[PDB]
Design a protein around this ligand. Structure first.
Ligand SMILES: N[C@@H](Cc1c[nH]c2ccccc12)C(=O)O
Ligand SMILES: N[C@@H](Cc1c[nH]c2ccccc12)C(=O)O
Ligand SMILES: N[C@@H](Cc1c[nH]c2ccccc12)C(=O)O
Ligand SMILES: N[C@@H](Cc1c[nH]c2ccccc12)C(=O)O
Ligand SMILES: N[C@@H](Cc1ccc(O)cc1)C(=O)O
Ligand SMILES: N[C@@H](Cc1ccc(O)cc1)C(=O)O
Ligand SMILES: N[C@@H](Cc1ccccc1)C(=O)O
Ligand SMILES: N[C@@H](Cc1ccccc1)C(=O)O
Ligand SMILES: N[C@@H](Cc1ccccc1)C(=O)O
Ligand SMILES: N[C@@H](Cc1ccccc1)C(=O)O
Ligand SMILES: [Cl-]
Ligand SMILES: [Cl-]
Ligand SMILES: [Cl-]
Ligand SMILES: [Cl-]
Ligand SMILES: [Mn+2]
Ligand SMILES: [Mn+2]
Ligand SMILES: [Mn+2]
Ligand SMILES: [Mn+2]
Lengths: 454, 451, 454, 451
C-alpha cells in the first residue's frame, strides 16, 4: 500500500536572506493547500535534505542563454503537459514529451535562424490553481497530484501533505530520465529531423509543409557538407519549469549557493507565476523577488501598462536581461488591441524582458459535448497577432508557451486531423486543460516558423 | 518519527523473454530477503513501470569504453561507498564522493597515459550479503537499507518490501544529481586538479607527491598552451554500479532495448563472493542481461572455475563484457592469481582484470572496530601489478571503497591514523572506507605503479 | 631587362622507377616545344633543385577527397583561367579567380548537399596545344607563356626555354598567395555568401536566384543557431591543377616520396591530359602511369567505349577510386547520344571513376565579329545533358570543369547580361579561349545547383 | 655557368601616403647597395605589382599573438639561417630549418606553460650589413645574395639590382613551401616530438634531458587520454621575418590594407645594430608601416635612447608592436640591461623583451674561423632571465641563428665541438649557427630556465 520515510542538516541563511524570505512568506498567498501546519513542516523537513532536481550552475547558464533571448538573438520554446500526473510519469510519456518538444525546436531553430532555448513543463508541474473550491460535481476541486487526487471521490480530494514528497520523487525520477535521454541520443538532430520527415509523409496536410521540411533537410545536409564538427548536433539541453504555486514545496526546495550567496529554487530551472497568483504585494511575487531563478509572470486581459511596469521593476530591479519573462495570454480576438500599449510602456523603461506568448489559456471554451477544449485556429491566430504587434513596434517576439503531449490524444479541435466535437471522446486524457497532440503541436511549429520567416 | 507515502500498467516483457527469464530465476538464490512474496510481487509491479535509472544507449557506450580497457588501451576506476544509506543520500555526500572519485581519476589518467573509465558505487548500492544470521547484539542482521534498517531495534531489522520503492526513489534522485554535476562543471578538469593542489598543500605527506602534482599541472597548462578546444575538459562521464543481489529489485528494473534485455538500475553490476554459485540465480541473471558484469574472485577460487565463469558470461566473445575482480589479500595475490590468469587468457576471451585490494585485507582492531591497514591495501595493488607485468597481461583497474568525508575508518595513510582515532568519525554503515585524503594518496601510489 | 640564375642535388631513383620513366619519355610526344636539348637540360637542372609548388602529403589528401567523389559522396569543381599569363599574375587577378571559384563552390555545396572539392586552373596553366603551328597571321602559333610570347611579333613567338623557369617562379608565387588567401580569411564562408547576396541584389536576373540565395542564407544561419564549431567555416582548401603538356616541365618537377617510394609531380596537385595529347601509347599517358597524382583524361566526340576502357585500365590499374577522372566535352547537341554507351562500358569494369563534365571546349564557335566565343545557353545545355545521362543510368554526375575569371570580361555571349557580338569588343581579354566572366560563372553555379537538386 | 631570364601597371599607392613615404625615405640610409638608380627604379617597378609574400590579415593576427607576448602570457621564438642563400634555398634545407624550429618550440611550450609564437628567419633574409668595405681577400665585401655573390670573384661581388627580383622569387617559393609544410603535418606535434625522442636516444648528453623529454611525452599522451580534439595539434603557424635593410626591396613590397600601409615581404622585420640611426631612413620606414618591428640594442645602448625608440615606433601604445632585442654579451647583459628596462617600463608602453644571445658573443678561433661558444650563449640567456626576474618584467623570447643541418660552426654543446672540427662542415655564408643538435640542446636549457 505504501512506502515510508524517516524524519531527521541545512546551513543557516545569511541574516538578510532569512529576513527577506520570512518577510515574503508572511504575505498572503492565494490558492494554497488547506492542510495542517504540523504535517507540512514534517514534509518540508524531509525535502530540505534531499538531492535537488537542478543545481545552481545550470540555472545561471539558463540565465545567460535567456539574456540572449531578451536582446533579440534567440527564441524561447516552453511546452509540455498542462498537469503532470504520478500515474503517467512513465518512460513512454516522458520520452513522448521530450520528443514532441524537440521536433518543434528543430523547426523553430531553422525558422528563427537563431538558437532556441528549450524549456519543458515537466518534473514539477503537479499543482494548479482553481477558480472554485467546489467543482461541477460537489467535490472539493482537484488541484494537481501534489495536493489531492484526480479520482472523483470525496476522500481522494482531501489535501494530503504526503503528496509533497511523492511530487519530488516523481520530479527527480522524470528529470533523471530527461537528462539521460537528452545526453544519450534522443536529442540527436538527425534523429529528430527523421521523425519530422515521417510526419510530413503521413500527415494529411503533408503537402502544406513538405517544402519547408525539405529546406530543413537541405540546410541540415549542408552542415555535413561544410564538414562542421558534429558534437553539438548530438545533444540538446532541456530545462525544467513549472508554475510556482505551492509555497510549501518551493520553500522546502530552496538551497543557498553563489558572486555573493543567494537563494536558488532547485525544484526546477525556471518558475513562473500564474494569473490567479500574481498579487503584487502577495507572497508569490515576493518569493520570486528572493530567488535567483529566471521567473515568468502571466499577464491576462485585465493587465494594464502601469501594472506590468510594476512587475518589471520588482522582479528585474538590477536590469538583468532575461531574468524576467512577461507571458501574454489575451486571446486572439484581444491580443492586437491590449498588448501594444503594455509593450510600449515596458520597453520605455530600459529593461530588456522576454516577450513570451501563451496562445492557449486565453482560448479555452466549452464544447457542445461538454469538454474543455481549445480550437486550433484560434491558437494559431493569437500567435499570429502576437507577431504582428511585435513587428509593428520593432520589438522581439521572444518565444511561445504551449501545452502539448507526445501522445496522440484528441483534446483540441481542428488542425490537419479535423478533430470534431464528436471525436473528442476518443482519447481525451488530460488531467486539466486540453493539449495539442503530437501532430497539432508540430503543425503549429511549422506555422509559427513561417511567422518567424515573414 | 515516521510518515507514510501512498502508491498504470504498460506492455509486459515479450513472452519469449519472460519465459527464458522465469526459467533462469527458478534457480536457487543466496542471500535473499525473507519477506512475503505477494508484497514483493506488488512492489515489483510498481517498479516495472517507473522511469529507469539508466537508458540502454548509455550502457552500450560503456561496453565500448570497457572493450577498450580489455584490449589494454584504457583503465577502470571503480569507487564509492561500501553501503549507501537513505539518510546519507544528500547533496553534500554525493558531491563529495563524486569529487573524490574525479580527483583519483585525474591522477590515474596522467599516470596511465590512457583514458580512465570512471564508475561509481552509487545509486543502487543499498543491499549487502551477510555471513551471520544473528549479529553481535543478538538481532537479525542488517542487510542494507533496501532490506531493513541500521538501527539496533527489533522492528527496524524486519525485512520490508516497500524499501524496494524507497531505494528506487533514492537511486534516481542521486543519479539525477551526478548527471547534473558531471554536466555542470564539478567535473571540470581544471577545478578538480585545483582540489588536488589544495591537497598537496594540506597533506602531512604533501612532499612525497609535489613532484607528480606539479608535473600534472604542467601537462594541463601544456594543453592550454597548445590551444586545444577544452570542451572535453569541462565534463566527465561517471557511471553507476552496485552489487546486483536483491533479485526482486534487479528483475523488476529489467527493460527491453536487434533487441536485447537490459537492467536499467545501473550501468554495470557485479556478483559478490557469497552469491556467484555457478548454478545459482545470480549468475543466470548475469547471463540473460546485456549490461557489463563483474564477478568477485576470492582466495578459494580455482583456475578451473574461473574458466567456467568465462564460458558462461562471455559466450559470444565480446571484449570487456565480463570483468573478473581479484580480492585475495596482499600476502596471497602473488601466489593465487597467476594460475587463474594463465588458465583464462588461455581460453581466447578478453576479460578485464580488476583489483579489489580491500575486501580481503580487513581485520578487527583491539579498539573493537573492523578496519583495514592502508599499507596492506597498497601492497595488494603492488602484487596485482607484479602478477600482470610477469604474465604480459593488462592490469585493468582498481575497485576500492572510499568517501569524500574526512572520516576515520582505515589505519595508516599520511595522517597515521591510530586505533585510538577510529572512534573519532567512524561513520560507515558496513565496511571501513578510505577517506578522502587516503583515497587520493592511493591514487598517487598507483600512479607511480603505472609508470 | 632580366634577372639571372646559376646552374648547379637530387637522389637517385629506384631502378624500376628510372626504367619506367625512361621508357615513358622515350615514347613520341605531341605538341612539344621545338627548342634545343642543350638548353632544356639546363633549365631542367635549375628546376630539379627548387622548392616544389605542392607536396606529396597534400596530393594523397586530395586523392582521398576525390575517392569520395568517385563513390558518389562529394562533387568536383574545377575552374580558372584557360591560359594564365605572366602579365596577369597579380594579386588582384589571383584574388579574383579564388573569389569566383569560392562563390561557385558555396552554391554547389548547398545544392549537392555534399562536399565540394575545389580545384583551380592556376599556378601552372601556362602551356596550350594548338591545331596548327601557323596561326591566322603567318606567325608561329602562340602556345602559352611557358613556350613563347602572346605579342604578334615573329621574335616573340620563338620557343624560349627560359620560360620554363619563369613559369615556375610565377607558379610558386601565385600558389604562395592562394594558400595565404585561403588560410587567412578570403575563404570564410560568411564572407563569400555576402558577395553572393551582393550579386543577387545587383544582377539583372537577381529575381531568378533570390529564392535560392535566401535558402542558402538560412541554411547558413542555421549552423550558428545549432551552435556548431565554426573553425571549418573560416577556411577552404583550393588545389592547383593544370594540363600536363610540356613534358620538359613536368619531368623536372618530379620528386620522390612515399607506402613504398613513388614519383609525385609537384608542379601541381592534379594534372590532366588533353584531347590533342591523349595518344594511348604516347608519352603523356605513359607519364601519367608513372606519377601518383590524380589524373584526368579529356574525352571528345570521337571517343569510343572500348577506348575509354583502355584509358581506365592503364591509368587505374589498381582500382583506386578517385585516381582517374574522365572529362566529357562533346557539345550540347551530342553529349546525350555519345556519353551513355561510354558510361555503360566503363561502369561495367568495376572501376570507380569521376565523371566530370567540360561544357566549354565542345561549344566554341566564331562570332560574326571575329571572336572565338561560346554561347552561355549551349554551355548550360551541355551540363543539363550530362546530368540527364547520369540520372538515366544511375551513376554519379561527378563534377564540372569550366573556364572562368573574376574580372568582368566580355568573352561569352548570353547570360543575364545579354552580352552581344557587338559587346564582345569591350573587354575581350583572354589569352586563348573565351571565359565566363564573374557574373556568368556564378549564374551557371546557380543553374547547375538546381540540376543537382532536381 | 649561367642562363638569363627576361621580364602591367596597377594603381599606385594613394598620393597622400606616397607623399609621407617619399618624405620618410629622403632621410639618409646606412648600408645601402651602390648600384645605379634607374636600374633600381626598374626592378622596384617590377616588384610593385608581383603577388605578395604575406597578406595583411596574417600580419594583424601576428600583432594579436605578440600583444599576448608583451602582456606576459606568451613567449617568442625566432630562429633560422643567419644569411639565406639562393643556392641553399632547397626543399631539404627549408624542411630542416622549419623542423629544427618546431622542435625547439615544442620544448619551450612545455617549459613556458604558455603559447609560443614561432617566427623563422626565412623568405627574405638575403642582405646583411658589413663593417669593412674591403674583406680579407681584398675584394668588395659580400653583402648578401640580394646584393652580390658569395664567390670570391671581382664580378660576383658587383652590386646587381636584378638580384632584387631573384630574391623575391626565392622568397615566395620558400614561403610557399613553409605554408604547405606547416599545413600538411610536418608540424604535427606528435611527429615533431618523435624527432625529439630520436634526439634523446642519439645525443651524447641524452641523459641530461631524458627526464624532461619523458615528462613532455606524458603530457602529450595526457592530452590524448583526456580525448581532446587534436586538430590544433596537427598544424602550426610559422611566420617569416628578416632584417629590413635594402630599402629598395622593402619599399617596393609596400601594399595598402580603416586602411593601413603594410610591408608584405614578411610578417615582421627588425632594424639591426648598424642601421637604427634614430634619424635615419630605416627607423622612419619602421614608423610608417604597420608590421610589427624589432630593434637590435647593443652594448653602446643607453636608457635615454631606448626611450626615444619607444616614443618613435609605438606612438599609439599598441602592445607588442615594438620588440627590443638585447645582444650585449654574457659578461655584459647583467650590468647593461637593467637600467634600460627600468627607463622603458617607466614610459607606460608594453614592449617585448627579446634576447639575442648570439650576435654579441662571437670570437675568432685560432683555426681561423669566426665562431661562438655554446656556454657563452646559454649564459647570456641565463643573465637575461636573471635581469627580468629581478625587475618583475616578462622575459619575452629568444632570437637565435640555427640550422637543421648537422653542421660544425659553434664550439661546445654535447658533441664537444673542437676548433679542429670547425673545418668539417662549416657551411655558413655569414655568422656561425647552432646546428640542429645544439639548437635543441639550447631549447632544453632555456626550458629549465622558464621553470
Ligand atoms: N545543440 C544545439 C543543436 C541541436 C542538437 N540537437 C537538437 C535537437 C533539436 C534542435 C536543436 C538541436 C541546440 O540545442 O540548439
Ligand atoms: N598549433 C599549436 C600547437 C602545435 C601544433 N604543432 C606544434 C609544433 C610545435 C609546437 C607547437 C605545436 C601551436 O602552434 O602552438
Ligand atoms: N571548409 C568547408 C566549408 C567552407 C569554408 N569556406 C568555404 C567557402 C566556400 C565553400 C565552402 C566553404 C569546405 O571547404 O567545404
Ligand atoms: N572527459 C575526459 C577528461 C576529463 C574531464 N574532466 C575530468 C575529470 C577527471 C578526469 C578526467 C576528466 C575524461 O572523462 O577522461
Ligand atoms: N528551507 C528553509 C530556507 C533555507 C534555505 C537554505 C538554507 O541553507 C537554510 C534555510 C525555509 O523554508 O525556511
Ligand atoms: N627529374 C628527373 C627524374 C628524377 C626524379 C626524382 C629523383 O630523385 C631523381 C630523378 C628526370 O627527369 O630524369
Ligand atoms: N509514479 C508512481 C511510481 C513512482 C514511485 C516513486 C518515484 C517515481 C515513481 C507513484 O508515484 O506511485
Ligand atoms: N533520502 C531520504 C529522503 C528521500 C525521500 C524520497 C526520495 C529520495 C530521498 C529518504 O530516503 O528518506
Ligand atoms: N609576373 C612578372 C613578375 C614576376 C617575376 C617573378 C616571379 C613572379 C612574378 C614576370 O614574370 O616578369
Ligand atoms: N634557388 C635557385 C633556383 C630558383 C630560381 C627561381 C626561383 C626560385 C628558385 C636560384 O635562385 O637560382
Ligand atoms: Cl536559517
Ligand atoms: Cl556483528
Ligand atoms: Cl636517377
Ligand atoms: Cl673578411
Ligand atoms: Mn493549463
Ligand atoms: Mn564492502
Ligand atoms: Mn581552353
Ligand atoms: Mn648574424
Amino acid at each position: 500500500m505504501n512506502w515510508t520515510v524517516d524524519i531527521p542538516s541545512l546551513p543557516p541563511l545569511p541574516t538578510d536572506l532569512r529576513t527577506r524570505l520570512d518577510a515574503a512568506l508572511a504575505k498572503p498567498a492565494a490558492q494554497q493547500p488547506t492542510w495542517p501546519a504540523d504535517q507540512a513542516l514534517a514534509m518540508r523537513t524531509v525535502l530540505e535534505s534531499v538531492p535537488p532536481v537542478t543545481v545552481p550552475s545550470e540555472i545561471v547558464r539558463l540565465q545567460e542563454q535567456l539574456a540572449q533571448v531578451a536582446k533579440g538573438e534567440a527564441f524561447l520554446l516552453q511546452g509540455g503537459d498542462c498537469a503532470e500526473t504520478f500515474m503517467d510519469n512513465t518512460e513512454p510519456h516522458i520520452r513522448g514529451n521530450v520528443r514532441a518538444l524537440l521536433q518543434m525546436a528543430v523547426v523553430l531553430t531553422y525558422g528563427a535562424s537563431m538558437p532556441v532555448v528549450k524549456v519543458a513543463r515537466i518534473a514539477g508541474q503537479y499543482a494548479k490553481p482553481r477558480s472554485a473550491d467546489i467543482d461541477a460535481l460537489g467535490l472539493r476541486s482537484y488541484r494537481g497530484d501534489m495536493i489531492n487526487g484526480f479520482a472523483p471521490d470525496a476522500a481522494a480530494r482531501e489535501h494530503d501533505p504526503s503528496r509533497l514528497v511523492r511530487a519530488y520523487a516523481n520530479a527527480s525520477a522524470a528529470m533523471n530520465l530527461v537528462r539521460a535521454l537528452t545526453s544519450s541520443g534522443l536529442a540527436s538532430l538527425h534523429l529528430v529531423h527523421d521523425w519530422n520527415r515521417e510526419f510530413v509523409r503521413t500527415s494529411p496536410a503533408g503537402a502544406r509543409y513538405e517544402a519547408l521540411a525539405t529546406e530543413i533537410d537541405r540546410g541540415l545536409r549542408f552542415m555535413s557538407a561544410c564538414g562542421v564538427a558534429d558534437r553539438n548536433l548530438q545533444t540538446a539541453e532541456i530545462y525544467a519549469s513549472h508554475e510556482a504555486l505551492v509555497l510549501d514545496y518551493e520553500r522546502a526546495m530552496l538551497r543557498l549557493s553563489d558572486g555573493e550567496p543567494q537563494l536558488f529554487d532547485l525544484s526546477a530551472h525556471t518558475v513562473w507565476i500564474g494569473e490567479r497568483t500574481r498579487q503584487i504585494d502577495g507572497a508569490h511575487i515576493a518569493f520570486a523577488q528572493v530567488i535567483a531563478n529566471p521567473v515568468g509572470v502571466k499577464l491576462g486581459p485585465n493587465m494594464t501598462p502601469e501594472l506590468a511596469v510594476e512587475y518589471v521593476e520588482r522582479l528585474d530591479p538590477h536590469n538583468k536581461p532575461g531574468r524576467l519573462t512577461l507571458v501574454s495570454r489575451m486571446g486572439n480576438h484581444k491580443v492586437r488591441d491590449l498588448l501594444p500599449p503594455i509593450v510600449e510602456k515596458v520597453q520605455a523603461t530600459g529593461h530588456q524582458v522576454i516577450w513570451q506568448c501563451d496562445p492557449m489559456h486565453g482560448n479555452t471554451h466549452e464544447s457542445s459535448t461538454g469538454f474543455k477544449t481549445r480550437h486550433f485556429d484560434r491558437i494559431v491566430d493569437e500567435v499570429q497577432g502576437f507577431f504582428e504587434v511585435h513587428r509593428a513596434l520593432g520589438t522581439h517576439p521572444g518565444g511561445i508557451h504551449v501545452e502539448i503531449t507526445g501522445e496522440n490524444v484528441t483534446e483540441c479541435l481542428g488542425g490537419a486531423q479535423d478533430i470534431s466535437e464528436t471525436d473528442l471522446a476518443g482519447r481525451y486524457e488530460t488531467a486539466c486543460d486540453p493539449r495539442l497532440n503530437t501532430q497539432q503541436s508540430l503543425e503549429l511549429a511549422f506555422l509559427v516558423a513561417e511567422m518567424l520567416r515573414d
